[PDB]
Each structure stands twice: as structure tokens, then as C-alpha cells.
A paper describes a structure:
Here, we report the de novo design of a [name] barrel with ovoid (twofold) symmetry, drawing inspiration from natural beta and [name] barrels with ovoid curvature. To this end, we report the computational design and experimental validation of a de novo ovoid TIMB protein, with a completely novel syntax and sequence. The designed protein exhibits an elongated β barrel architecture with loops which are not structurally involved and a more developed hydrophobic core. In accordance with our design goals, the protein folds solubly and is highly stable.
In order to assess whether the proteins fold as designed, and especially whether the ovoid β barrel curvature is maintained, we determined the 3D structure of the [name] design by X-ray crystallography using molecular replacement with the design model. The experimental structure aligns with high accuracy to the design model, with an overall Cα RMSD of 1.59 Å. In particular, the β barrel showed excellent fidelity, exhibiting just 0.74 Å RMSD over α and β carbon atoms and mirroring closely the ovoid curvature specified in the computational design. Side chain packing in the hydrophobic regions also closely followed the designed rotamers. Especially, the close packing around A93 and A207 suggests that the placement of sterically small residues at the ovoid barrel minor face was a successful strategy. The redesigned β-α loops are free of any critical hydrogen bonding or structural interactions as in the original sTIM11, enabling their redesign and diversification. To assess the quality of the twofold symmetry design, we aligned the first repeat subunit to the second and found close agreement (0.74 Å Cα RMSD), indicating that the designed twofold symmetry is self-consistent and viable. Deviations between the design model and crystal structure can be largely explained by shifting of the helices and loops and may point to potential targets for future redesign. We noticed two main points of deviation: disagreement between the fourth and eighth helices (α4 and α8, which are symmetry mates) and the design model and disagreement between the seventh helix (α7) and the design model (these can be observed in Figure 2d). The total hydrophobic contacts and total buried area across all clusters are increased significantly in [name] (174 contacts; 7864.8 Å2) compared to sTIM11 (81 contacts; 4067.8 Å2). However, visual inspection reveals that previous flaws with sTIM11 are eliminated in [name], such as a cavity in the central β barrel and gaps between each of the hydrophobic clusters.
Residue numbers in the entry: 1 to 228
The structure:
Amino acid sequence: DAICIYLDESATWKDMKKAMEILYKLGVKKIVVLFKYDEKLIKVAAKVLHDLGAEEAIIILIFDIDDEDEFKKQVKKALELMKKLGVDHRIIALRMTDEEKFKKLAKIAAELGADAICIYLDESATWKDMKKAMEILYKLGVKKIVVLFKYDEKLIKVAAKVLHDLGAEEAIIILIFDIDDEDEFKKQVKKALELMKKLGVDHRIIALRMTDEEKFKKLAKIAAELGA
């Protein structure tokens, strides 16, 4: 499928731009980018994607706001900027935590015009939290459910079963991998893709942390040759 660039929070916008050109060069049509809401990062992603001309790209914005009106405030500002910039596919990522908190926040993002909603599970999340989050998004009637987590075989099988149970045909799984150990990275990515294809996950994205240009190019090559 596609490849998502995850910005290392120690990465800069020049790091981001270089990761995008590398994927373009490798022949990746769907270049997805993932970061915590950042006005400057949104503007750079939009210009680079326009320069490359891959209007089949996606910006995924991570929000982590306690406050409910600060959330609406920021999600509105984010979506309107992305609208100015002609970003056709904008997704708002929400971490799970409180069940009621998750529902009101997803509702707010859906109201403001978020194209899809993404479930971002942090390492404090269980598979039971994931299932509940997915059921809440389905109940709300959101079009495309997206789930984003660190590579985990249980979470993959659970996610695949819940989507099949809800009938969520448009849903997407995005997996984040550790990168320091390149051998393990190759093994885990290989395994992830095989297992997701056995379970009929049709829309799966491999996410790569952007660190060093030399490192990123290695990982992206590996992921592409394996089938991402």
C-alpha cells in the first residue's frame, strides 16, 4: 500500500521535506504524514506535496488536548488552514483515555469537518480500549475509521476482527515500528504485512520514524520491497 512518515519530534521540517522526497523518488503515490498539530509543519507538508504533485497524499494531525473548547479551538484552526492549502485528505487523530472524553471529542472533530477520525493508542492502551474506541466511532457513524498503533500481533488480530464485525470496509490500520534494530525491523514489517493480508485488511500503512536521511532511506526501501 502506502508509507507514513512519523516526525520524531526531534525532527525538523527540513527532515520532513527530505523524507517526502525520498518516498517520491522510491515511487510512493500515497505519501502520508503524521505529526502533532503544528502550524509550520502543516504549511511545509502542503507545499512539498503540491511541488511533488501527489494530491493522493494525506496529513494526519495528532491532538492531545485536555480542554474541550481548546480542542475545538485548535481543531478548527487546523482544519481551516489545511482548507486554505488545498489539503484534500485531512485526518484528526485522537488518543483513547476516558470513554466519555473520547466520544465528545470525536463528535466535535466530526462536526467541524474532519474527513476521517484516527484512533491513536498509546502504550498505556489495551486491546479492550481499542475495541471500545472503534465501536464508539462506528456508532457515531463516522465514514472512515483509522487505527494507529505500535506494531503488535494481538492488536492487529483484534483490530481486524472488530472491523470485520462492524463491517467497516473503508477502515485503515497504520503500524509504527521501532527502527534502531534494522534486522528486527525487517522481520517485524515482513510479519505484519503477511498477517494483515491473511486477515483481509485491505488498507494498511507502514509508518516510519524520520530520523536521519540515510537511515530513513534504508527503512523505506526495506518496507517497499516487502510490499508496503
